[PDB]
Amino acid sequence: MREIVHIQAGQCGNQIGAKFWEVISDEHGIDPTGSYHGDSDLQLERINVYYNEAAGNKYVPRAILVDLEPGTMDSVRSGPFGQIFRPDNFVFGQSGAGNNWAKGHYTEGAELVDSVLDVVRKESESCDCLQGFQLTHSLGGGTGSGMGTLLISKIREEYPDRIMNTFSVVPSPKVSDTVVEPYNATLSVHQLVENTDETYCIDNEALYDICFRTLKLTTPTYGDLNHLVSATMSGVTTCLRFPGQLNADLRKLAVNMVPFPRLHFFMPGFAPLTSRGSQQYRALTVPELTQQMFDAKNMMAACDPRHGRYLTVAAVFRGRMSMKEVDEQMLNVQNKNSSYFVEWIPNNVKTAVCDIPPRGLKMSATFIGNSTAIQELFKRISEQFTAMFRRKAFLHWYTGEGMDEMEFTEAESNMNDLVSEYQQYQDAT
Amino acid sequence: MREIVHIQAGQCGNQIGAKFWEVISDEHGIDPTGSYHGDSDLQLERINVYYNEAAGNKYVPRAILVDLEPGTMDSVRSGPFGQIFRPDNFVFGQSGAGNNWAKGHYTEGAELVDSVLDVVRKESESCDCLQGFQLTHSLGGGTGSGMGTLLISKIREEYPDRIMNTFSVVPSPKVSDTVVEPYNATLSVHQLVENTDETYCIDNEALYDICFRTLKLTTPTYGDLNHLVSATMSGVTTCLRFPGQLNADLRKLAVNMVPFPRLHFFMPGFAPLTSRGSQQYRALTVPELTQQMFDAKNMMAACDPRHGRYLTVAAVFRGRMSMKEVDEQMLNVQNKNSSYFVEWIPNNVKTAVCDIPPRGLKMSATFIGNSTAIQELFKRISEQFTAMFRRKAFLHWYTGEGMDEMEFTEAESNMNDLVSEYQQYQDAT
Amino acid sequence: MRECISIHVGQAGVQIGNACWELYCLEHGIQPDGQMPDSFNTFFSETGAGKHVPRAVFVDLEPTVIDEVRTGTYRQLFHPEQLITGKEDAANNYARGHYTIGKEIIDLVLDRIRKLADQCTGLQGFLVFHSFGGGTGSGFTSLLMERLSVDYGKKSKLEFSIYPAPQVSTAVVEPYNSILTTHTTLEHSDCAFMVDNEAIYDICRRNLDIERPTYTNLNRLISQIVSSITASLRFDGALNVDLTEFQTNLVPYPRIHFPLATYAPVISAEKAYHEQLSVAEITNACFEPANQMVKCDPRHGKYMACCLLYRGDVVPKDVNAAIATIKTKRSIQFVDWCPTGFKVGINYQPPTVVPGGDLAKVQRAVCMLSNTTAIAEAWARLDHKFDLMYAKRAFVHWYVGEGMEEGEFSEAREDMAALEKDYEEVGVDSVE
Amino acid sequence: MRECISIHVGQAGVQIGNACWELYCLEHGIQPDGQMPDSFNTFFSETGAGKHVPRAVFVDLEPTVIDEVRTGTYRQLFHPEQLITGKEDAANNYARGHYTIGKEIIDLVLDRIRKLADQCTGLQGFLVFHSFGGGTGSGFTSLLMERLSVDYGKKSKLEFSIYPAPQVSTAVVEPYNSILTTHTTLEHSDCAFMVDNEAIYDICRRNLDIERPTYTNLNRLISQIVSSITASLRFDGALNVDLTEFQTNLVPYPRIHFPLATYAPVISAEKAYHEQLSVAEITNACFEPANQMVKCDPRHGKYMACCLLYRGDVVPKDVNAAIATIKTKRSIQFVDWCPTGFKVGINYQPPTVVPGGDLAKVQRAVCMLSNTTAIAEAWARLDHKFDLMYAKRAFVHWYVGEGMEEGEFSEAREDMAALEKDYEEVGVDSVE
Ligand SMILES: Nc1nc2c(ncn2[C@@H]2O[C@H](COP(=O)(O)OP(=O)(O)OP(=O)(O)O)[C@@H](O)[C@H]2O)c(=O)[nH]1
Ligand SMILES: Nc1nc2c(ncn2[C@@H]2O[C@H](COP(=O)(O)OP(=O)(O)OP(=O)(O)O)[C@@H](O)[C@H]2O)c(=O)[nH]1
Ligand SMILES: Nc1nc2c(ncn2[C@@H]2O[C@H](COP(=O)(O)OP(=O)(O)O)[C@@H](O)[C@H]2O)c(=O)[nH]1
Ligand SMILES: Nc1nc2c(ncn2[C@@H]2O[C@H](COP(=O)(O)OP(=O)(O)O)[C@@H](O)[C@H]2O)c(=O)[nH]1
Ligand SMILES: [Mg+2]
Ligand SMILES: [Mg+2]
């Protein structure tokens, strides 16, 4: 039970998700064909959460792939693990998003959203008891920002009691990968505060540093960045798929981590992360995995946690480990960094321990941080939004698609309402 | 327990330390890989003081290697026992120190000191109960003098109750290996009197005589000089690593040898030292090891002890020996050389006896002398400093790096404050 | 399935397309016969047999340049109804291109566009290759962009203009044809990529070490620009960018849609060695003012939006390592309202080398499409070339005698004076 | 990763670099094609293939010496954009090197320096090989050292000047070019290593037993000096010394930065035997006044700082056995403020022999870089050569007519008179 429908929007969400289903198939022993080839029966005990069993003992992913251009769909279906998907799920347009929120949320995306929701509703009826939906997309693109946040608004109306966690790639501080990404992110964060139960802010600048500084990859491709996200994506739901000594699910990580219904913007983290040479020069213990998470250089969002306070922290562990060694370290980071945690939430760490490690590792972790440190994430975008909007630059590509200037004023006011809330509970005593 | 973090600064400290970890790995039976290959369990009983046990039953040194040029780091990692270190510890700059104290303590070293302290603090948290830190460097160089004394000032602020023993190669009387070594030594001795608990003054001129006169090495390389220092370095901490009939540690040799908190400048000594031919023509007895230490020609500092008085003397012994034969000889040198010891400290010899000898030897010693004979060590440098500073020669390479002439006047006054103190307690009755 | 048809107007348009469609057949393995011994679909429609034909409309009002295509090596490649000729050229006359000769076959060209657009299931937009100097490239294009904006409207219509050089001009009435074509195509084109001849004269001399470059050599470099722009449609890339995304990221205001193309590396075989050509090395090549392909000083202006279109063995981490240095540099300054001034596209395919080409086989490249304030000095020159000639009313009787009003010149000059102050309005900083 | 680019100005600079870069390819096994069948990185950047190219800028205002490089054996080694030529030489005219001809390509040379410095991640400093006699080596260098001190400033800029001999001069206006280049490079260079032709004429005759030595033979010995200075970067040594350490140990005052190079052993194959060449034997060779490479009497002055750069099979104990004897000798006297007057560097690599070379394959060597008071007599000669010529105002119309003021000569002479009294101020002893 507790099945999850995975939705992939944008070029980015399709490239993350094609690496995500590479991890899930490896954890459950699934071949490129779709047939089970593992050894343990613990892989098939909760196989149904990410898989529909087809006839002939084949498992197909419960993934819905959405794009507005057919270029990304050809990359999936011709690449490895592309034949595993149902060809009914590949719902793609022809025009492309045009790197535009309005062409993804109003013009081309609304023509395709009924082609997706009829597949969303078809997958949701085959599920026995639906857990909730996860969406992988970006905020700087057009399909991941426009078509993606359109799907959330149309699903939360149809499924208001379910969880809607998004794995949203957030625009980076240093480089801009899109000239209109302050416009695309701000119009999406307007949609994410009203329709998602939790949201996982990922920066490309942060994953560049982790591949360079921590993993010592001088030349990391996108597929090396996607392997970092996909190990985090499976790490959030690993106690839902495998037995553990203290199980969590997507609702336990929602209840424990969201003290206020707007404040659900998380920064992820993963441990251990070692190079090829520097893996034999380090012991894999729970105090090592703890101290690797709670620093700044292991955040997959490009914002220093030391400029803020953690409201709530979820550290989901994997592998055969002892609970005292876990519970000592979660206390240990709260003592010595008591200024770095919020005061009026005592004992703000959620602990989940699975029994199954990732492939080829002895034990692992997954950090889910809900800090006030992402107020600098939205102070930067709302500054980059206001600098562009005060001259009304690039506005006629969105005004020309049925939108007014009022939509931008309300979305920028909603973000400055949100930054004021993270500023409030950082200074609240 | 009682772990030691070894820090290596400068070209010199890296070349001494790479020979030092060659000795410690031989005493504990450690291969080039890092895996234990000894025979006795006494080697692993206190393995943790200089080693972190990694996964797969491998021991990595707790060594932090610091330089401002990458030339020395390539010599370590490509030489023998270079693959044993953690590659995280090799913290090196690109510019090189420029044979300059100010470029090591202010300009380039301050850019790199936070890269070292974050590794120092990382090693210090993995330690169960921290004993204290040892630093190997020089006083005539730029990294060993500037970057090295910068690390001591930043650690003693963070760890004020720990011991900070330095193994500092002091400039020689006869030759000068650096034109500005009166400037580099004097600005470092200003830092060593305020931030180290004990300091081991080593001269290159003295080790040349010991290799020539005593060991009959007509052609000693640096690696033969480093083998003399490394056997002394392991000899100070050998009762901390192995059982003994009268154990000492780095605190017992600190309390017994430092009567006044400025007067902590020691001269080391080692015995036995025999040639290849002249080793079968001599019996290894405790009266022979005693009389080999307390002369002048076995001091690793180039200053005659007969021109001063020993305040306190530590003679750490190794090997299965009898305590009466030890205690008779320590009395015997105090009777016949009663003018050579200070009067108002009765019985000024500290005795430590380990049970484990060095490799291939039956028994050994290690002399730690705190004499007034190193007032001639600082009378020479402060003379060479004042001769250069009175014409302000070579000053613009240090004034141009943010320093004034007041720093030189205070450091030269601090050294003449120190020489007056060794002159005081030599004549005090 | 993301089809894109291209129009080639004038002698400059066709001779560029002779290098472009030579290049596309090499990138897709297509023979000159249309044969090959599924990614071609954006520019190639396929017949029932194994013969692929291009989605190109070559139009000229004189038959000389087309009859070299009809008898060349690529005779068998092109559909012979697409190679549209007139009888007499527009002949450096905008009025003959727009009123006299252009109206005769404008219904023939639109009929051939519509037969291509019917067999396109995913038609994204148009690629109009023309020049500002010639009468056909100025007159007939401005007639054509009016008609395509009526019939299609929402399609993204990209122009690739040969902008006239300041000191190098091959015709006398180039300041007349350029102003009259820009007044017309302003409200009808969506993004027009300026390219100059004198700057590519400089690049073929300095960077390629050619003493004597031909128009054949210049059209090879402009073909590499268009092949890098349309690289994301024709090939699978790590970070793709479509034709609708260029007009979104580069056009802040509907008047200002004139970026300038810049390609790197431009090296020969003797300099194929002797440098490693990292993605940071070729990116600092683009923002260098000597390597741009429009004779303007970008140090004398501010970049409004840049578009770096990488391709080949390009690692996305070193991309960010390259671009973040450029925002620190003072010589590359942006506009106050634009903190986010980059669009990055990475493709996996290296740019291929045409045999007989003067570029070397590189592992990576970059087509910088930078919209800048520095092109206002280019229009300030061209208005000064217009205001000298029109004050004495020179050459006006050639244009009035073919269907134009004399007051229409003052209408185009007041609009261009309104266009020149738009860069001045954008280039200043914001108050408070 | 400790990269170091080198600049070669004038005919003297390039012909030294023809021997230097021949020597470096032998030390690293590099073919003349740049191939080899990880220690090269300080002077060699590597391409994508196995072809290593040098970090050298060869600049001359006449194309004759460069076209011998472009057609020589090392044609394929050098990046052809680095070999920078003019059209007309500076022609023994400082004003043509600094104002007339030098300003034309100074922006071209700095553009090629910057393309090297961008691909250097650990750029330590510069090696400017020039001469004081020629117009290019005096004029263009003094133009270049101004520009590099602006653009870089903190980089250690080492010069290797061919100082003009007292009785051997090959040009007439060498006393003019030497004073005018020294007034300019004084506040811009950090350490300039003087080398003389007449002294190496003496060494090739006496020590190498060559009756008739060429400029080819002199440039082999100056190449061994620079290869011994940069031996610690390129190779792992027992006691290493970097370019920043030379300016620290040898420059007591920012005006006085003119040491003199001295290499030993300089022997042939017939004298490769018949002596064992210990490290004490070759060290007493250096302080002997006959073996220095500047025509000065070091017995007539006081050494301020010496820098013994050993290499090869050198044992550090016998180093101290060698140097401690020299402090006892009366003929080698130091200055009163300097009791510590030695910097020692030991490398493990022996100096290699170039085939066709006149030096013998030795196991060890020494490059003594001694800063002394005895070079004040060299500037006392050169001011006396300047004061004779300028009193009659000879040759001034060649310099005024190319962009220089006549008062600028008196400005350089008063500064050199201020420089001459600096050695007198340092050479005296201290009171009390
Ligand atoms: N870049 C480039 N420009 C060209 C080429 N051929 C012609 N031109 C330019 O085209 C401009 C004139 O336009 P043309 O195409 O020759 O004339 P047209 O467009 O046919 O109009 P007509 O005058 O009626 O013939 C000149 O300024 C040339 O610089 C070419 O092969 N490459
Ligand atoms: N040591 C050495 N000196 C050289 C060599 N070639 C020329 N010189 C010296 O260079 C001095 C003159 O400088 P040049 O390099 O010939 O002239 P320049 O620097 O090119 O300046 P121009 O007069 O404009 O040509 C003469 O005094 C020569 O002694 C050489 O191969 N080795
Ligand atoms: N982490 C990561 N980010 C990606 C990847 N591919 C694209 N992106 C990001 O996605 C954004 C582009 O959005 P995209 O979905 O391609 O645009 P759209 O097609 O118009 O919706 C850029 O900001 C990229 O940084 C990837 O493989 N990994
Ligand atoms: N005993 C000993 N001393 C050394 C060794 N190597 C260098 N030294 C001394 O270290 C000093 C040089 O300092 P160094 O660290 O190399 O300079 P830096 O790199 O600028 O800090 C000289 O006085 C040498 O005598 C060695 O192997 N053994
Ligand atoms: Mg024509
Ligand atoms: Mg010359």
PDB file of N, CA and C in Angstrom, chain B residues 171-198:
ATOM      1  N   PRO B 171      68.271  28.197  13.583  1.00  0.00           N
ATOM      2  CA  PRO B 171      69.430  28.504  12.737  1.00  0.00           C
ATOM      3  C   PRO B 171      70.766  28.264  13.425  1.00  0.00           C
ATOM      4  N   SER B 172      71.709  27.759  12.641  1.00  0.00           N
ATOM      5  CA  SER B 172      72.996  27.285  13.114  1.00  0.00           C
ATOM      6  C   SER B 172      73.936  28.458  13.363  1.00  0.00           C
ATOM      7  N   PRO B 173      74.972  28.278  14.204  1.00  0.00           N
ATOM      8  CA  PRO B 173      75.905  29.386  14.443  1.00  0.00           C
ATOM      9  C   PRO B 173      76.847  29.682  13.290  1.00  0.00           C
ATOM     10  N   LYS B 174      77.411  28.641  12.681  1.00  0.00           N
ATOM     11  CA  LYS B 174      78.490  28.852  11.725  1.00  0.00           C
ATOM     12  C   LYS B 174      77.953  29.302  10.376  1.00  0.00           C
ATOM     13  N   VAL B 175      77.142  28.470   9.733  1.00  0.00           N
ATOM     14  CA  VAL B 175      76.629  28.777   8.406  1.00  0.00           C
ATOM     15  C   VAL B 175      75.274  29.444   8.576  1.00  0.00           C
ATOM     16  N   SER B 176      74.901  30.254   7.598  1.00  0.00           N
ATOM     17  CA  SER B 176      73.538  30.724   7.500  1.00  0.00           C
ATOM     18  C   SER B 176      72.886  30.144   6.259  1.00  0.00           C
ATOM     19  N   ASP B 177      71.760  29.472   6.467  1.00  0.00           N
ATOM     20  CA  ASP B 177      71.051  28.808   5.387  1.00  0.00           C
ATOM     21  C   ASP B 177      69.997  29.726   4.782  1.00  0.00           C
ATOM     22  N   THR B 178      69.955  30.976   5.226  1.00  0.00           N
ATOM     23  CA  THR B 178      68.955  31.957   4.841  1.00  0.00           C
ATOM     24  C   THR B 178      69.507  33.318   5.228  1.00  0.00           C
ATOM     25  N   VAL B 179      69.410  34.284   4.316  1.00  0.00           N
ATOM     26  CA  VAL B 179      69.961  35.605   4.581  1.00  0.00           C
ATOM     27  C   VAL B 179      69.126  36.333   5.633  1.00  0.00           C
ATOM     28  N   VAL B 180      67.828  36.046   5.695  1.00  0.00           N
ATOM     29  CA  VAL B 180      66.955  36.764   6.616  1.00  0.00           C
ATOM     30  C   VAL B 180      66.516  35.882   7.777  1.00  0.00           C
ATOM     31  N   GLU B 181      67.271  34.822   8.059  1.00  0.00           N
ATOM     32  CA  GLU B 181      66.946  33.996   9.219  1.00  0.00           C
ATOM     33  C   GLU B 181      67.119  34.665  10.590  1.00  0.00           C
ATOM     34  N   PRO B 182      67.934  35.720  10.807  1.00  0.00           N
ATOM     35  CA  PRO B 182      67.758  36.453  12.075  1.00  0.00           C
ATOM     36  C   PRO B 182      66.425  37.163  12.182  1.00  0.00           C
ATOM     37  N   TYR B 183      65.817  37.528  11.058  1.00  0.00           N
ATOM     38  CA  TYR B 183      64.500  38.145  11.102  1.00  0.00           C
ATOM     39  C   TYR B 183      63.406  37.103  11.289  1.00  0.00           C
ATOM     40  N   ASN B 184      63.577  35.918  10.699  1.00  0.00           N
ATOM     41  CA  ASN B 184      62.517  34.916  10.764  1.00  0.00           C
ATOM     42  C   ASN B 184      62.499  34.218  12.116  1.00  0.00           C
ATOM     43  N   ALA B 185      63.675  33.999  12.710  1.00  0.00           N
ATOM     44  CA  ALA B 185      63.728  33.340  14.010  1.00  0.00           C
ATOM     45  C   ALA B 185      63.212  34.253  15.114  1.00  0.00           C
ATOM     46  N   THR B 186      63.580  35.535  15.073  1.00  0.00           N
ATOM     47  CA  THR B 186      63.239  36.451  16.159  1.00  0.00           C
ATOM     48  C   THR B 186      61.745  36.745  16.178  1.00  0.00           C
ATOM     49  N   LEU B 187      61.120  36.783  15.004  1.00  0.00           N
ATOM     50  CA  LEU B 187      59.681  37.000  14.956  1.00  0.00           C
ATOM     51  C   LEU B 187      58.912  35.735  15.311  1.00  0.00           C
ATOM     52  N   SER B 188      59.589  34.587  15.336  1.00  0.00           N
ATOM     53  CA  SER B 188      58.921  33.355  15.732  1.00  0.00           C
ATOM     54  C   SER B 188      59.085  33.096  17.222  1.00  0.00           C
ATOM     55  N   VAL B 189      60.257  33.428  17.771  1.00  0.00           N
ATOM     56  CA  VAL B 189      60.507  33.254  19.202  1.00  0.00           C
ATOM     57  C   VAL B 189      59.635  34.210  20.014  1.00  0.00           C
ATOM     58  N   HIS B 190      59.263  35.348  19.417  1.00  0.00           N
ATOM     59  CA  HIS B 190      58.203  36.188  19.971  1.00  0.00           C
ATOM     60  C   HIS B 190      56.893  35.418  20.106  1.00  0.00           C
ATOM     61  N   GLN B 191      56.603  34.523  19.164  1.00  0.00           N
ATOM     62  CA  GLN B 191      55.350  33.779  19.224  1.00  0.00           C
ATOM     63  C   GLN B 191      55.478  32.534  20.093  1.00  0.00           C
ATOM     64  N   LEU B 192      56.689  31.990  20.221  1.00  0.00           N
ATOM     65  CA  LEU B 192      56.840  30.714  20.912  1.00  0.00           C
ATOM     66  C   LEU B 192      56.846  30.884  22.427  1.00  0.00           C
ATOM     67  N   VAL B 193      57.212  32.067  22.921  1.00  0.00           N
ATOM     68  CA  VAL B 193      57.261  32.264  24.368  1.00  0.00           C
ATOM     69  C   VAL B 193      55.865  32.464  24.928  1.00  0.00           C
ATOM     70  N   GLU B 194      54.917  32.819  24.074  1.00  0.00           N
ATOM     71  CA  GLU B 194      53.593  33.167  24.550  1.00  0.00           C
ATOM     72  C   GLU B 194      52.576  32.068  24.310  1.00  0.00           C
ATOM     73  N   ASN B 195      52.905  31.072  23.492  1.00  0.00           N
ATOM     74  CA  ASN B 195      51.893  30.146  23.024  1.00  0.00           C
ATOM     75  C   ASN B 195      52.315  28.686  23.026  1.00  0.00           C
ATOM     76  N   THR B 196      53.529  28.356  23.453  1.00  0.00           N
ATOM     77  CA  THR B 196      53.941  26.965  23.553  1.00  0.00           C
ATOM     78  C   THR B 196      54.272  26.598  24.991  1.00  0.00           C
ATOM     79  N   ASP B 197      53.949  25.361  25.350  1.00  0.00           N
ATOM     80  CA  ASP B 197      54.264  24.863  26.677  1.00  0.00           C
ATOM     81  C   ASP B 197      55.692  24.358  26.773  1.00  0.00           C
ATOM     82  N   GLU B 198      56.263  23.909  25.658  1.00  0.00           N
ATOM     83  CA  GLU B 198      57.660  23.507  25.582  1.00  0.00           C
ATOM     84  C   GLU B 198      58.088  23.518  24.122  1.00  0.00           C
TER      85      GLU B 198
END
